[PDB]
Amino acid sequence: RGSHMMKVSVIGATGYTGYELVKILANHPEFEIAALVSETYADKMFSDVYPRLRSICDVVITGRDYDAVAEISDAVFLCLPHAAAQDAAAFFYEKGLKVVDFSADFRLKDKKLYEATYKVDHTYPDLLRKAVYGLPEIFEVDIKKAELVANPGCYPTSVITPLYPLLKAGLISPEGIIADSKSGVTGAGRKADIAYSFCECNEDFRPYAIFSHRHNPEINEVLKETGKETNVLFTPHLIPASKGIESTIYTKTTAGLAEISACLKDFYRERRCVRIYDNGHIPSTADVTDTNFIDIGLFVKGERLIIVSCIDNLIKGSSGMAVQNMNLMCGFDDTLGIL
Amino acid sequence: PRGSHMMKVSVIGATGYTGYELVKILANHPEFEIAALVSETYADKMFSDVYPRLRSICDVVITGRDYDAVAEISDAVFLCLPHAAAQDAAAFFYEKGLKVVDFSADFRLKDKKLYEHTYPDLLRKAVYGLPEIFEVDIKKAELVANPGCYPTSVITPLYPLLKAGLISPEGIIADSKSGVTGAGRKADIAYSFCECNEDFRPYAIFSHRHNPEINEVLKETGKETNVLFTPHLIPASKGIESTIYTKTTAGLAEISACLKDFYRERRCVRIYDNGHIPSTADVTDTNFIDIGLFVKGERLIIVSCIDNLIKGSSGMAVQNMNLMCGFDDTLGIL
Ligand code: NA
Ligand code: NA
């Protein structure tokens, strides 16, 4: 209704995650957009860059003035790349804003692991200790008290969410897990690279980053929080489609389907974004594209458990989760303005 | 140009996507010459009425299912017929002395028990037509079962490694992905443009018919495997990629040496061990199988890519026919 209105800004607003985030913020009943920052498209209206939003979000894009942003905003979403994200997050944090950082810079509590993976130095160790990993259906208790939240990566969301309760309850082995995952091309971001051009990706399907994708350590670092050390092997693939992630996950269980289903449905019992199937239904990316849902299908044969996990990469894998995090930091329901 | 060793060949069930790709290859083949193209649905239409891309290339008039007429004008026949029909046709042309390649599954598994099958005597005689492995058996046969498309991408890289004992036979996982042409020319809502476009999905979990095919054939290595196979539908027309997870004790150089030695004379097999990752666009519209190899500690990851309608079907079928007819297996392909 506007009674608990808060001003929110987006830094790095013209990438694909910024577009999905603005779409949500525009219709959110308590967040009011204050600034949309992009150094490249400054002095243009957001609807000049994204004409689909003409007459819905016509806010004039401004340049990088962080003092300007802090003085007009209660909260900021950072869609910046690494390193720049650290400086901005640190600035807006001490100014007293609520901060959601899309980047990886504050996700990994282990500083050397970060520097080794991202090949850049981490210069805010105390802030790194304070940041909360933004998986709303798992770490809600901690997010509600946070002022700095590291938004999870898109592939880690699709793999962590179904595995977390089963590891913690001891129903699957922590060793030998294979996640064979596939994403739409929007996962590369708004890029001019030849490798992301239409003619190179259209009709093509490929693995990439074999034994080397920066999300594999994130998955295993977070799942350690279940009390069990994991060695998930993660391999991504590029789908000739704009949006959508599917993860096929292979595990070993001593339990039967009924117990595995009860563990997941009990753990996610109040979480409207989590849709769990145990009846033979197979999630596909079209079931979750343009939604904030995560769909999980369960299949058991003997000791083999296969999990199919689907999300929209830009919404449950990024912007929608970012708004759930912001909702939670602001005292709102996690699904406010979402579903 | 007609060749000095010309032979006549017919195609039964010619108007599906496998028949289309097969006709493309036959029309350019320097020795095979098309005699009949049979399709009860499109009889009395020219092949290029169904596939206008082939206009002025293959304008052969399609005929109905009169198998005596085919046998009288053909030295050999390709059967792209559905289950059961394929059994009677292959029994007929075998009696009449024709070389036969059957695209269906009805003659792939020697063990009748897995099928449950009429013609059990004939089932004994059918040869599994994986040309880069069973060449010996193929040349001496009169009935070949063309292998399935997914088994082709998975058996081919795993066979030598199991035989040489370089990977474990237990615990192998094949996570495989295919273009929609793998469903054949069908009027099903599930295969419509609007249902498949922009969508990606696993299917047939724990239940795809190609998965016992993979394991039955790999038993010929001397190893009892339990390959877990899961297929997925790509929103693209053609192409298979198989990501294969194995356990090895051997190093990259040894695994590579095994594969490149076992396939050293086989021009359709392209093996990479240098970090190059194959993609479906590298093999689409070709008869190549591209294999990438990746080792970390005890983990071997294999990436295997084919055109599902050519190397996984029609181009392989012409390899099998070439071999049965005394030609080099890549004649008219490379
Ligand atoms: Na709003
Ligand atoms: Na020809």
Numbering used by the authors:
A (entry chain A): -4 to 334
B (entry chain B): -5 to 110, 117 to 334
Anything the authors wrote about it?
Here, we seek to establish the direct reduction of formyl phosphate into formaldehyde through developing a new-to-nature enzyme, formyl phosphate reductase (FPR). We identify promiscuous FPR activity in four enzyme families and present one homolog of N-acetyl-γ-glutamyl phosphate (NAGP) reductase from Denitrovibrio acetiphilus (DaArgC) that produces relevant levels of formaldehyde. The ArgC active site can be divided into three parts, the NADPH-binding domain, the catalytic site, and a substrate-binding channel. The catalytic site consists of catalytically active C149 and the HRH motif (residues 208-210) responsible for binding the phosphate and carbonyl group of the substrate (gray labeling in Fig. 3a).
While four of the homologs displayed no FPR activity, ArgC from D. acetiphilus (DaArgC) showed a formaldehyde production rate of 8 µM/min, which was about fourfold higher compared to the Pi route with EcArgC as FPR. Based on the kinetic parameters of EcAckA and DaArgC, we speculated that DaArgC was the rate-limiting step in the cascade. Because in vivo formaldehyde production was limited by DaArgC, we next aimed at improving the enzyme’s FPR activity through protein engineering. To that end, we solved the enzyme’s crystal structure and identified key active site residues for site-directed mutagenesis. To increase DaArgC activity with formyl phosphate, we aimed at improving accommodation of formyl phosphate in the active site by introducing larger amino acid residues in key positions to close up the active site of the enzyme, excluding binding of the native substrate. We targeted five residues of DaArgC (S178, G182, A183, Y203 and L233) and used iterative saturation mutagenesis (ISM)26 to screen for favorable amino acid substitutions. At 50 mM formyl phosphate, WT DaArgC showed an apparent kcat of 0.1 s−1, but was not fully saturated. WT DaArgC showed a turnover of about 1 s−1 on NAGP, which is in line with activities of other ArgC homologs. While we could not observed major changes between the TGAGR loop of DaArgC and the TVAGR loop of DaArgC3 in the NADP+/NADPH-unbound state (RMSD 0.119), it is known that in mtArgC29 the GAG motif moves closer to NADP+ in the bound state.
